[PDB]
Structures are given as C-alpha cells and as structure tokens.
A paper describes a structure:
Careful analysis of the obtained CESH[L] structures revealed a potential active catalytic triad consisting of D18, H190, and E212, along with the active water molecule in RhCESH[L] while the corresponding possible catalytic triad in KlCESH[L] consists of D48, H221, and E243. In light of this hypothesis, we constructed another inactive mutant, RhCESH[L]-E212Q, which was expected to halt the catalytic reaction at the second step and create an enzyme-substrate ester intermediate.
Author numbering:
A (entry chain B): 11 to 247
B (entry chain A): 11 to 246
The structure:
Amino acid sequence: QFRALLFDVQGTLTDFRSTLIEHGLSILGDRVDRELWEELVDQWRGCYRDELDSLVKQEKWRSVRAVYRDSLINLLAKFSDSFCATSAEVELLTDGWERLRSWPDVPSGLEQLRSKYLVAALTNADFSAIVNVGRSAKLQWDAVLSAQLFGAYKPHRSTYEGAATLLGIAPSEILMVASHAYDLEAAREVGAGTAYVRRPLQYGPTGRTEDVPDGRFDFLVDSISELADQLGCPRLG
Amino acid sequence: QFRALLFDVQGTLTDFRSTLIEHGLSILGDRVDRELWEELVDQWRGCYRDELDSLVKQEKWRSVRAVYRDSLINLLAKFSDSFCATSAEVELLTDGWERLRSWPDVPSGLEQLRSKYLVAALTNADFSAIVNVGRSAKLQWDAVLSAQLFGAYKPHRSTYEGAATLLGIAPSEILMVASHAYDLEAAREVGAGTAYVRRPLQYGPTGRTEDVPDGRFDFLVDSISELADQLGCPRL
C-alpha cells in the first residue's frame, strides 16, 4: 500500500535534546551549568513550538533557523543574569539544531526500509537544516522535503500533500513516521498511514513522553528497524 | 570554496540513452528494431529538448513526465506504421526516463565527493523522476532538487539560486556539475563553479560532442571520481 515513508526527523530520528545540550555546553563551556543549559534547551524547543504553532495558525512560513535564533535571543534575554552569548555564539548555538545526532536504530532502519520504500524527510526545519542534519545524523534519504518547499509547516495539509505531489504518489501511499502524535494525526487527515516511533529518551532521562496506545496509529514501534520489519522489509545482513 | 556539488543527472550521471533503448526494447519486444527504437529514443530526447526549450522561452513549467509522455505519443504517431504502443506501454515507456542507469563511475564518484561536499541533484526532471532515478542509478544525494520545486527549468537563474538558497549556501559555494555546457554556463551566470563531465557516449557513438575546451569551465573531467580527485577528496 505504501510507496514512501515520510519521516519527521527531529526527535523521531534524532536525539535533538542530547545534541542541543552537548552543543550548547561545548560552545558556552563554564558559562552555563548543564542543569541550566538543559532547561534552556527545553524552553528553546518550547519557544520554537510556540512560534511554529503561531505561524501555522497564521498560515505563514518563515525560516525555522530564524525561529530558533529569535527564540534563543529571547531566551538569552531571560537568562541574561546567568550568562550571555555573542551574536556569533547565537549562530553557533542555533547551528546545534542542524547538528542533530540520530538515534542508534535510525541509519540501519532507514536502509532497511529502502528495499521496499522510498524514504523521505518531511521536516519543518529549513531545507538546509535537514540536509545538514543528514550528515550529523547519518540520514540518507531518497528525498529531503522541508516546510520551506511548501511555504507551510506540518501539521498543515499542504506539507503532506505537497510531499505526496512531489513524490508522485497519493497521500494514501505515504506512511508518515513521527514520534509526535500531532504529525501523524495531520498526515492521517490527508490519508497517509501513520507510524509512531516511541522515543522514551527524546526529552531526556526524566522527560515526559506521549503514552501512545496500540491501535491509535497504523504502527507503533520503538525503532525504525522494527517498523521496517513490520512493513515486511527484508532484514539487513 | 565549494560546500555543495549540484549535479545535472540525465547524461551527466546517467546513461539515459542506453537506459531508454534497453527499456523500450524490453517493453516493445519484437515490435521494434533496436535501430528504429534507438532513432526514436534520440528523437524523443530531441522532442523533449524542443518542448523544454519552448517552455523555458515561454516562462512556463510543466510536468517533465508529461513532456516525455506527450512527445512519445507524438513520436508513436510518426512511427505508427512501424509499431504501436498501448496507453499502458506509453506510461511504461515514459517510465524509462525515471529508470536511468548511472555511468559506472558515478556512485563511487558521488561517494568520494560526500566526504567534503554536499552533493545534490538539480534536474529539470520532475521531483519524483529524480527520486526514482536515485534508485535506478544508485545515486544517493544530500538533497534532490527539481525544476518542479522552482516552477522553472534550468537554465533559469531561479533554479540554481533556488538550489543555493534551499541548501543555505552561496551560489559561489556551489560547484555545478553537468555534461551540458548550457547548464554550467547558466550556473556560472548565478556565480556557481562549473565542472563539465565529458560523456562521449551520452548520445551514443554517433553523438555530437560539445566544444568544451580546458579552461572553459572550472573543471573538465571524464568521471565524477576524477572531479572528486581534483577537488581534493581522498579515495575511499
């Protein structure tokens, strides 16, 4: 039934939280303790989601890198007592979102899926970010699709359907793979299949995760490889 | 100086002629001689090029698959005394353009380049076509860019510049890689580096060769691996 798997990347395929924590700490060093920087990372993603939530409501697209940067600048103002960052460091910190490392299952998972499916990124991240993430996260796609291509973020239907259009397939032939229910629900609305990837450490060792029940989505897996097995993709050697 | 190599794919990386000849012969079987099908394949590409020139002149974008299909249909009418195709075979024949096999240097050449460069396809083919060709030609990209993304075909500046902007890199940090002078000349006009890949068999043995001397483009190579070597990429 499915011709292509479209993947959310951040969190779903990538441990963005570990990346952004280690990245900030590498850049800022002694200037912020791990505990405070983790807090910042969490608020940063939170500001990002709030801005994207806003932009989706406004049916507007803007550079997600600019979203991360503006959110970071707003957050550095909030924490200006604790530490500061130069504009150069703001850019280097914001680069962290394009340095996401993948979960260990993901490369072999993606490779396994490719025997039977096209695999494409469908990310709200700017096109250049997902391309960069491809390198840090060792993601090799048939296609990289970004909100930037459609002028709209997920969950807007034009992303999934524009992905379907670009891939020359029906939305019903897309299996959306995400570790965020909103993404799957929105893909479902255009008729795509839904594959939920549990990422219990996505928000850290004490992070609160969606408790997706079986039967909510077409697939519910702990790894891309397990998804690949359930789609009948031959195992890798 | 280059952060990304942007590749034309058809001809540059793929032996489309051999692909389309073998593909058509597979589909049509006894119905067509190799010599006739070769001629049609060459005329088909020419109809595509003519129609693409029209659309480019005409500042419109159209599905390139539809361009191939429509031109094939027109060619089948011209060749109707010799053989026929059903509509299903028209689709299957048209699919050959999405089944391009690469020249043998290309996959390892692309792999050698990735150590230092982002490698992206920038094709006039539809997005789904180049994705499909990624499978048939074993092309693994950092990014797949199509004229379809830009509503304009190469050589239009919005393709190279859209590619640059999408990749988040200056055009001058793009090395455009193509086996067609027009593509490199247009990429040059937006500031991209130029690498001409000679493909002497691109149009088969009797094909006419572009007058591309050394120094006309930044690089002049016979393989993607050779380009990789000249760009300082270690062998894998």
